[PDB]
Amino acid sequence: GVQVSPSGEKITHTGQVYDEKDYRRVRFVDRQKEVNENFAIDLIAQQPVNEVEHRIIACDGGGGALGHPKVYINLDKETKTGTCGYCGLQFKQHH
Amino acid sequence: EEMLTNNRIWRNRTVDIGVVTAEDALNYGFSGVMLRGSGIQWDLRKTQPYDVYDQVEFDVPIGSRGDCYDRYLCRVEEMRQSLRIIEQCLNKMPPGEIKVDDAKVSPPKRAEMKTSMESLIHHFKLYTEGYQVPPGATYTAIEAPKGEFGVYLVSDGSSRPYRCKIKAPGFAHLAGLDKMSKGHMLADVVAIIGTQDIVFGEIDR
Amino acid sequence: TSVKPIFSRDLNEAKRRVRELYRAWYREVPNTVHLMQLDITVKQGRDKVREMFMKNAHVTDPRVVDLLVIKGKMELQETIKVWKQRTHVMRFFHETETPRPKDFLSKFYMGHDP
Amino acid sequence: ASATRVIQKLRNWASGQDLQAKLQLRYQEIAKRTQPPPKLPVGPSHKLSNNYYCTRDGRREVVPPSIIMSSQKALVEKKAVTPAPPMKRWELSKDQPYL
Amino acid sequence: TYKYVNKKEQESEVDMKSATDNAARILMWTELIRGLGMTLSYLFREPATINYPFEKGPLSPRFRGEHALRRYPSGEERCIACKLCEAICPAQAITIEAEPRADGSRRTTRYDIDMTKCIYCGFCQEACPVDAIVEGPNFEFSTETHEELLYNKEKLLNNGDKWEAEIAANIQADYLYR
Amino acid sequence: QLITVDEKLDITTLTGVPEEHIKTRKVRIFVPARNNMQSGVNNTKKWKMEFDTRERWENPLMGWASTADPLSNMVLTFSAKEDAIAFAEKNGWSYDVEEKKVPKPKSKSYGANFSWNKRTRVSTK
Amino acid sequence: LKKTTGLVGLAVCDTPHERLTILYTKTLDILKHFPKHAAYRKYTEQITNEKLDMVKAEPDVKKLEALLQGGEVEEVILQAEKELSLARKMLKWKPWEPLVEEPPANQWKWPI
Amino acid sequence: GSDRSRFLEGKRAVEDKNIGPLVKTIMTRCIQCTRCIRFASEIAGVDDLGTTGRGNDMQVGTYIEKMFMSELSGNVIDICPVGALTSKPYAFTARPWETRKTESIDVMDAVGSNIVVSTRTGEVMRILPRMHEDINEEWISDKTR
Amino acid sequence: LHHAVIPHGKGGRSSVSGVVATVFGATGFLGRYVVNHLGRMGSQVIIPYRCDVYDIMHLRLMGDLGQLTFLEWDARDKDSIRKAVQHSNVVINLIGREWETRNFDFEDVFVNIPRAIAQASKEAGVERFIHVSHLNASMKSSSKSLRSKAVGEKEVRSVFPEAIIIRPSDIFGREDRFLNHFANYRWFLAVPLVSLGFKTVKQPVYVADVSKGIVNATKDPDAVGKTFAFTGPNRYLLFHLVKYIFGMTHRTFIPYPLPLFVYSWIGKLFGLSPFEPWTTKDKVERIHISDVMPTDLPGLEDLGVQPTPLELKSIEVLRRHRTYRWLSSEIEETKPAKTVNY
Amino acid sequence: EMVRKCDPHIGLLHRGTEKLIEYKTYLQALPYFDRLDYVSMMCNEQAYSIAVEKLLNIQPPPRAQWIRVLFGEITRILNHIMAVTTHALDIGAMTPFFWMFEE
Amino acid sequence: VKQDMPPPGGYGPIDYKRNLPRRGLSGYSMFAVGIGALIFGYW
Amino acid sequence: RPTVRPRSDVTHKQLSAFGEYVAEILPKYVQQVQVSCLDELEICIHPDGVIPTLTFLRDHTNAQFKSLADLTAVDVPTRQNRFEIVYNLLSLRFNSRIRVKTYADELTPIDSIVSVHIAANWYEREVWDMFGVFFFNHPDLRRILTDYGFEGHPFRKDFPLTGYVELRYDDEVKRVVAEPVELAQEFRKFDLNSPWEAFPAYRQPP
Ligand SMILES: CCCCCCCCCCCCCCCCCC(=O)OC[C@H](COP(=O)(O)OCCN)OC(=O)CCCCCCCCCCCCCCCCC
Ligand SMILES: NC(=O)C1=CN([C@@H]2O[C@H](COP(=O)(O)OP(=O)(O)OC[C@H]3O[C@@H](n4cnc5c(N)ncnc54)[C@H](OP(=O)(O)O)[C@@H]3O)[C@@H](O)[C@H]2O)C=CC1
Ligand code: SF4
Ligand code: SF4
Ligand code: SF4
Ligand SMILES: [Zn+2]
C-alpha cells in the first residue's frame, strides 16, 4: 500500500514522510528511496481464519523449531477472533 | 622443512641470532616458546593440562642452543606433534553433548525454547543480562602458540565483569628485543621479531 | 597530615624542581621548530609553555607538584626526541575548537551548558 | 588428473617423494555436501526425575576464600613446606628422541 | 616427554668417505639444488586459483554475512521488537524503537544495523526466538559510501524479501544443530 | 621522612577533564531506588554517583540520539556515603547527596483480616 | 662428565661436591647473625642441612640429582649462590620485625 | 527455580478483558496471587476485580464488563509482578534495560510525590514512583504517570 | 525554524546549525575551506560538482556522516539548478575561474551563472545568496573580468535583492594563485614586475578569514543586503610584497621591469595553453589594477573575524618553494616587509 | 647498520579491550578475545572460556573438551604457518607463504 | 536413531614423522664426473 | 558430579600450608594470606615491602617463583588506597602459581621490581599509562599504549568510555587534530544488574 504523499515521496509501513518544508529530502536527489511495497498490515489481512473445532488451540509458524514459540489462545469470544502476538493468524471455534 | 632446514642462507641467517640465555628468559617472562627453545622443559599441557590433554600423548619439542633456528625447529616440529594429536582427537570422540548441561550458564536448544517455558526464560536472560558469576579472581594461563596466554578475571556478583586483564605473550617477548638485538645488525634484527611469534593485537590491548 | 612525601619535602624544595623544568623547555622550543617544520615563530611557542605552567599554579600540595613535573619530563623527553609530531605539539594550541563565550548571555544562545 | 604420467615422474623426482597420493587439490575424497539430517543426543539430566538443580548447582557451591594470618581478624620443631611437590625430568620421547 | 631437535654433534672421527660427502655438499652447494628441484616440482602442478566472479569459492550454510529480516510464509514481518537482539549485540549496533502497529499487533517502527558496526558474530540470529533477524550468506555488498552501510529496516526487509529462497534452505539445514 | 599538609587533597589536575567537567558539572550520590515492578531490593545497597544529563540531539541522518558530553553514562558503585563525598570533593566535582530511604518495619498479622470488631475484615477471603 | 647441558649460557662449572658445599656451609655462617627466633633462619637451615647431607654422602652426580630435586645439578649451584645472596639482603633488611607497620584501612572486603 | 520443564501436557488460556485504556489485560499469564484485589479493596476502596471460579478455571477479574477507572488504577501495573495487566500507552515502546532512570518529583498535584522518570535516548517512556514513606507511600496517581 | 533546522547541538562535527547550504564553487580553492568551516560546526552542505568524482574526494571528509551530499550539473541547462537550491536556507556563490575557456567566458561565468542561480534560487524561496565579487571591481577597470564582475553585482541585486555580496582582496593560502604565482617566477631568469613594483598597493587576505567571514554572514540577523569587503591589515606595496616572498623563499630576487606593452602580451603567449595557463591577458592586469583604500564598508571585524597578517602565515604557503639549505629558516629570520598607510 | 639501542613504541594499535569487557557481559565479551591473537583465535576463546568456568565451578562435557582441544591445535597449525613463513618474507623466501595459504 | 557426529573404527595411521630421503651420486662420482669433464675440456 | 568441576582437595592444603609459611617467616608487611576454592594462593602485603617478598620468591629454595606473568592494577574507588596492584608468579620447579597484591592511592607510589623481575619494565609503564601509579627506581617510565599527548589515565573508572577528545583531519591546517568529543549514537548504558543476591551467605551483612 505504498501511496505517494502530496509532496511526492512514498509512505512506509509507518507514516514517516518528510514534509514539503523539510531540508532532509536532498539525500534522495540523484537517488531514490528504498521502501518495501509489501506491507504486512495487509498481507496478514489477506489470510483466512482457521475455523477450528476446539476452544483452546495452538499456533506455530510451520515448524516448532522453525518459528513461533508455541502459545495457546482462548476462543470463547465468538464476536472477535483470537490471535497470536507473534504471527497475526486468526482462529474461531465453529460452535 | 626441506627448503629451509638444510640451506646455508637460512642456516647462516638465523643461527647465532637471539642467543637469549636460559635464566634471563624467565627474568624477562617469555614462558611460551622463547624459553623451551633454550632448553627449559616447560609446557602447560604436560604440566597443567586444562582441557583434555591428560589423555593425549605427544612430545614437547625442546632445543638447546636457542638461536632463532633451534626454536624454528621447535616451531616446525610442534606443528607435527599437534598433527599427531589430530590423529587422536579424531579417533576418540565420545557421542555426548556439546554445551554445558546447565541452562542458567549455557542457553538451551533453539527448539527446546519453543515447547517449554523455562528454556524460553533463561534464553531471555542469558542473551540480555548474563548469568551472575560469583565474585572471585583467577589466572588461566594457556599455551597458545605464542605461549602463556593469560587472563586475570576479577568478578563481582553482577553479570558484567569487573576488570578483566590479558597477559600477552609478546608483551614480554618484545621487551626481549633489546638484549637479543645486541651485536646484531639491521638485517637480522628483522628476523628476531619473527622469532617471537609477534602479533600486535594481544600486546597493544 | 603526616602523609608520605615523594621526590621532595615542603613545597619550597619542590619549586626549584619546577624551575629546573622551565629551565629545559625555554632552551628547546627553538630546537623543535627547526627540527620539524612549524609555523610558530618562537614567542607564541614559548608563551604557551608559560600558559601551561600558569594553569596549575593554584596547586598547594608538594606531592602533586612533585608529580606534575614528572609528566612534564615525559612530554619533554617526548619532544626533545621526535617521538611526538607536528600534530601532537601543535595540539596544545586548540586552534580548531572555537573558544566558547565565558559570558552568561551568549552561553545559552547556544546550548544548555551551565 | 592433469598429469599425463610423464610429469608425475618428473614432479615426483624433482621433489624426491610421491605426491600423486598426497596432493592438496581435493577432488572427490572429501565429504560431500547436503549431509543427511542429524538427531543430536540430549545430554544427561534430561531424565525427568532426581534432577533437582539444588544438587547440581556448581555455581553456588562456592564459598569465600579461607583467610590465613589476617592482621586484625583471624591471627592464626616445625617442618618446612613447599607450595607443591616439585616437577622433575619428565621422560625422553621414545620413537623419535633426536629430531 | 621432550624431544631434542638440534642435538647431534659427536665427533666420530669422520672417515674420508664422510668428508667428500661433506666436501661435495660444499663446492657444489647441492643442498640448495634440492630446493631448486623442489620449486620445479610446483610449476608443473595445477595452480589452485579460481576465476573469482565465475568461480566463487566454497561456503557452508552457516556462513554469516549480510543481515536480513525474515518473514512468515503469509507476509507478517517476523520481528516482534523484543530488544534481546541489541541487548546482546556487543558492537552496540541496533536500535529498534517500536509501537503497536494500529492493528493491535506488535511490530517495529524502527530497526537498524550500522554495518560499519556489526562484528558479524551471530548473537542476534541465535537469540531471536522467532528467526526474524538472520545473517545471510552475502559477502559481495561493498559500497562506495558510508551511508549505504546504515541498513535501517526497508533495506533489510526487502533484503530478506530477496534471499529467503536461499536463507531457508540453510536454516532448514541447520535447525537441528542449534 | 613524613610530611604534613592540611590541604583539601585536590586531584583536579592529574586527570585531564579540561575545564567544563570540573565546575560546570553536578554530581548526585544516592542509593538507587527500587524498580517497583519487582520486589527486588538488591539493586539498592550501593551508593552510585550518577551525574546530570545534558543535550541529546537527534541525528539528522538517522534518528540516533547523539551527544558531546561523554561524562553522562558514568555510574560508579561504592559501599558507603563517607567514601563517595571524599571522592568527588577530591576530583573537583560538586556533590548533592540524597540520604538512604529504608522502609519502616510494619506489624503485619494474617489474622487482622478476620476480625470481629475491626475494619480490616477483608473480603475475597 | 657432562658434555653439553640442555640449557644455554649455564656453563658446566665442573668439580661439583665442592661449590655445592662451599655455599651451603657459607649460608650456615651468614646465618647465625640473624635471631634464632626469626623463622627464616629456622627454616632454610632445615633446607641446606638436608642438601648438604645429600651431597656429603652421595658422590655420584646422576643419583644425587634424584635426591635433591633440581635436576641438572649446575642449576642448583645457581640457586645455592642465590639464596646465599638473599640472606645478605634479608640481613640489612629486618623482615622478622613485629606485626605490620600501617595495617590496612578496610582494604580487602572484595564484593563492591 | 529449576532449568528444565518436565511439563509436556498442554496449557490453558484465559479470556481477556477490556478494563480500560490504561490497563491492558493479558490474563493467560496471571498466576492468581490476589495482589490486585487486595489493592482494589484496601487502598482504592473499589471491590471489583474478584476471583471467579475454582481450580485452574479460576480467573481473576470482573464477572461482567466493567471499567476499573479510578485514581490509583495505574498502580495495579506496578504491583502485578507478572506482566498480565500492564500499561497500554507504554505497551511496546521500550524494554527496561534500554532505559535510563532519573529520580525526580511529581508536579500537577500539591503532594510533591516522588518519581522515577525513565528515559530512552533523550525521550520519556514511563513515569514510575519512588518509595518514600511520608509522601504517598509507595505509589502514584494516574494523572502523573 | 521548521523543527530540524533548529540548532539543537553543541559545537559541531555531529551537531546541527540550520545552515543547509549550497556552495557551487566547492571544487577549487576557496570552497574547500568553506565546506570545512560549515561541516566542522555541523551543517548540511550541498556541493554541486560539474567535474571529476576524483577531484571531489577531499570534500568527502570535512563532513559528519550525511551532511555532505553531492550532485551533478552544468551551467548550460535548467533543472540542474532547480534541484540543488530546492531544499536550502542558504546559497553561496564562489564560481569564477581566472580566464576564458573555449565555452565559458568571463561574461558566461561572472554574470550569467549568478543570474540564473539567484533567479532559480529566489523561486525556491531561500533567504540568503552570499555572492563573491572581487574588490577593485567597480566599473571602467583596466581588465575584462572586473568590468564584468560588477555586472554580476548588479544582475544579482536586480534578481535576488537582499543578497550579501563579499568583495574580497587578492587571497593567499596553501595552493593559492597569488603567492604561488610570484613564487614560480623563479623558474625564469627573474621577476618581470611593472614599474619596479611600485604604483601597486595591495592588502591581501587569508582564506580562513574569508571563509570564517562567510560562515558567520549566513547566521547573523545583520547582512540582509550589506555589502562587504574582506581586505585584511598590512596594506603592503608590491615590490616589498614580493621581496618578502623571495626572502621567505630564499632563492633570489632581482627585478626586470617592463611596461604593459609587452608584459600583457607575454600573457597572450602563455594564454595559448589548452591547460590551466600560467598567465593571461588579465591575470597580469589584476596584479596592477590592485589599488584601493578602505572607505566605509563593514569588513571582517564587524562580522566575526579578527583578520590575520601575512607576516605570520607565510611559512605554510612558501615552505615548499625553498631548497634544502633553506628548508628550515624560522620567520624570526627574514626581515618583515615595509607597510604603507597612505 | 649495527644496532646499539632500540626503543619500540608499541601502542599504535591500542584500542582498550581491557576497559570494554568492563561494560559487557561474559558472552558479550567472548569475541574480543579472538582479536588479541588474531592468528590463534580459538586458543584465546579456549582460555577465556575456562577462567569463566573456574569462577562458576563448572566443567564442560567431554565431547566439547575434545573438539575444544581439536581446534586448539588446529590454531596451532594456523599460526606456525603464519610464523614460519612471515619470518621468511622478512628474510626473503616468499614461496612457502603461498604454499601454505592454500593449505 | 541418534547420530551427532562420531567417527568410525580406526581411521588408520597418519604419517607425521619426518622423511627426507637422501639421494645423489655421492661424493666421488661428483668430482670424477667433474674433473673428467674438465680434463676433456683441456684435451 | 558431572557438571561442577571437582574441588581436588589435595592442592588446597599444599598452598594453605605454604601460606602460613610465607607469613610466619615474614610477619612484616604481610596480612591475610588467603587461598580460594579455586586452588590458588593470595598474599596481600604492605607496599613498603614489595621487593623483600619478590626477591624472596625469586631467590629461595622452596619458593622458586623466578618467572613473572602479569602486573595489573585494579581500581576500587570506595577505599582510600583504590589501586590494588596484583602480581602473579610461577614456579617451573613446583608447577604452582601465586598472587601477591598490594594497594596504593592516586598518590602513594610503589617501588619498582625491575631489578628483581626485568619483565616488569613495561608492565609498570602501562600501569603508569593506564592508571597513574608512579614507580620509584624505574628505567624510563613513560607511556606505551596511549597517544603522545593523551591527558588522562584511561583505565581509571573515573575516565569515560569514549574519553574527552577524538581526532580528525582539518584541511584548513592539514593535520589530524583534536576537537572535543561529539558522538553520533550515545553509547547506551544498559541496566543489566538484577536484584536477587544469587549467592546467599556469600554476601554483605550490615
Ligand atoms: C685435474 C687436475 C687439475 C684440476 C684443477 C681443478 C680442481 C677442481 C676445482 C674444483 C672447484 C669446485 C667448485 C668451485 C666453486 C665452489 C664455490 C664454493 O665453495 O662456494 C661455497 C659457498 C659456501 O661458503 P661458506 O661460507 O663456507 O658456507 C658454508 C657454511 N657452513 O657456497 C655458497 O655460499 C654459494 C651459494 C649461492 C647459491 C646461489 C644459487 C645459484 C643458482 C644456480 C644456477 C644453476 C645453473 C648453473 C649455471 C652455471 C653457469 C653456466
Ligand atoms: N582565489 C583568489 O585568488 C581570489 C578569488 N576571488 C574570487 O573568489 C571566488 C572563488 O574563486 P576561486 O574558487 O578562488 O577560483 P577557482 O579557480 O577555485 O574556481 C572555483 C570554482 O569555479 C568553478 N567554475 C568556474 N567556472 C565554471 C563554469 N563555467 N561552469 C562551472 N563551474 C565553474 C570551478 O569548477 P572546476 O573546479 O570544475 O573548474 C571551480 O571549482 C571567485 O569569485 C573569485 O573571483 C577573489 C579574490 C582572490
Ligand atoms: S530478537 Fe528477533 S523478533 Fe525480537 S526484536 Fe530482535 S529481530 Fe525482532
Ligand atoms: S552479527 Fe553480532 S555484531 Fe552483527 S548485528 Fe548480530 S549480534 Fe550484532
Ligand atoms: S496481581 Fe497480577 S498475577 Fe496477581 S492475581 Fe492480580 S493479575 Fe494475577
Ligand atoms: Zn503464531
Swiss-Prot record, chain E:
Residues 70-99, 109-138 form the 4Fe-4S ferredoxin-type domain. Keywords: 4Fe-4S, Electron transport, Iron, Iron-sulfur, Membrane, Metal-binding, Mitochondrion, Mitochondrion inner membrane, NAD, Oxidoreductase, Repeat, Respiratory chain, Transit peptide, Translocase, Transport, Ubiquinone. [4Fe-4S] cluster 2 binds at C89, C118, C121, C124. Its cofactor is [4Fe-4S] cluster. It is a peripheral membrane protein. Its EC number is 7.1.1.2. It catalyses: a ubiquinone + NADH + 5 H(+)(in) = a ubiquinol + NAD(+) + 4 H(+)(out). It is found in: Mitochondrion inner membrane. [4Fe-4S] cluster 1 binds at C79, C82, C85, C128. One of its GO terms (biological process) is proton motive force-driven mitochondrial ATP synthesis. Core subunit of the mitochondrial membrane respiratory chain NADH dehydrogenase (Complex I) which catalyzes electron transfer from NADH through the respiratory chain, using ubiquinone as an electron acceptor. Essential for the catalytic activity and assembly of complex I. Belongs to the complex I 23 kDa subunit family. This is NADH dehydrogenase [ubiquinone] iron-sulfur protein 8, mitochondrial. The chain holds residues 35 to 212 of 212 of the full protein.
From Swiss-Prot, chain G:
Its main location: mitochondrion. Acetylation of Lys-94 is observed in liver mitochondria from fasted mice but not from fed mice. The modification N6-acetyllysine is found at K26, K32, K42, K56, K94. The modification Phosphoserine is found at S85. Disruption phenotype: Lethality around embryonic day 9 (E9). Conditional knockout in the central nervous system does not lead to any visible phenotype until mice reach 10-11 months of age: then mice become lethargic, lose motor control and have difficulty maintaining balance. Defects cause loss of other complex I subunits and reduced NADH dehydrogenase activity. It is a peripheral membrane protein. It is found in: Mitochondrion inner membrane. One of its GO terms (biological process) is aerobic respiration. Keywords: Acetylation, Electron transport, Membrane, Mitochondrion, Mitochondrion inner membrane, Phosphoprotein, Respiratory chain, Transport. GO terms for cellular component: mitochondrial inner membrane; mitochondrion; respiratory chain complex I. It comes from the Eukaryota. The modification N6-succinyllysine is found at K94. Complex I is composed of 45 different subunits. Accessory subunit of the mitochondrial membrane respiratory chain NADH dehydrogenase (Complex I), that is believed not to be involved in catalysis. Complex I functions in the transfer of electrons from NADH to the respiratory chain. The immediate electron acceptor for the enzyme is believed to be ubiquinone. Belongs to the complex I NDUFA5 subunit family. This is NADH dehydrogenase [ubiquinone] 1 alpha subcomplex subunit 5. It comes from Mus musculus.
UniProtKB/Swiss-Prot annotation, chain I:
It holds the Pfam family NmrA. The modification N6-acetyllysine is found at K154, K335. Its cofactor is FAD. InterPro entries: ComplexI_NDUFA9_subunit, NAD(P)-bd_dom_sf, NmrA-like. GO terms for molecular function: NADH dehydrogenase activity; protein-containing complex binding. The modification N6-succinyllysine is found at K140. It is found in: Mitochondrion matrix. The keyword Transit peptide applies. Belongs to the complex I NDUFA9 subunit family. Complex I is composed of 45 different subunits. This a component of the hydrophobic protein fraction. Interacts with BLOC1S1. Interacts with SLC2A4. Interacts with CLOCK. Interacts with RAB5IF. Accessory subunit of the mitochondrial membrane respiratory chain NADH dehydrogenase (Complex I), that is believed not to be involved in catalysis. Complex I functions in the transfer of electrons from NADH to the respiratory chain. The immediate electron acceptor for the enzyme is believed to be ubiquinone. This is NADH dehydrogenase [ubiquinone] 1 alpha subcomplex subunit 9, mitochondrial.
UniProtKB/Swiss-Prot annotation, chain K:
The chain crosses the membrane at residues 25-43. It is found in: Mitochondrion inner membrane; Nucleus. It comes from the Eukaryota. Belongs to the complex I NDUFA13 subunit family. Complex I is composed of 45 different subunits. Interacts with CARD15, but not with CARD4. Interacts with STAT3, but not with STAT1, STAT2 and STAT5A. Interacts with OLFM4. Accessory subunit of the mitochondrial membrane respiratory chain NADH dehydrogenase (Complex I), that is believed not to be involved in catalysis. Complex I functions in the transfer of electrons from NADH to the respiratory chain. The immediate electron acceptor for the enzyme is believed to be ubiquinone. Involved in the interferon/all-trans-retinoic acid (IFN/RA) induced cell death. This apoptotic activity is inhibited by interaction with viral IRF1. Prevents the transactivation of STAT3 target genes. This is NADH dehydrogenase [ubiquinone] 1 alpha subcomplex subunit 13. It comes from Mus musculus (Mouse). The lineage of its organism: Eukaryota, Metazoa, Chordata, Craniata, Vertebrata.
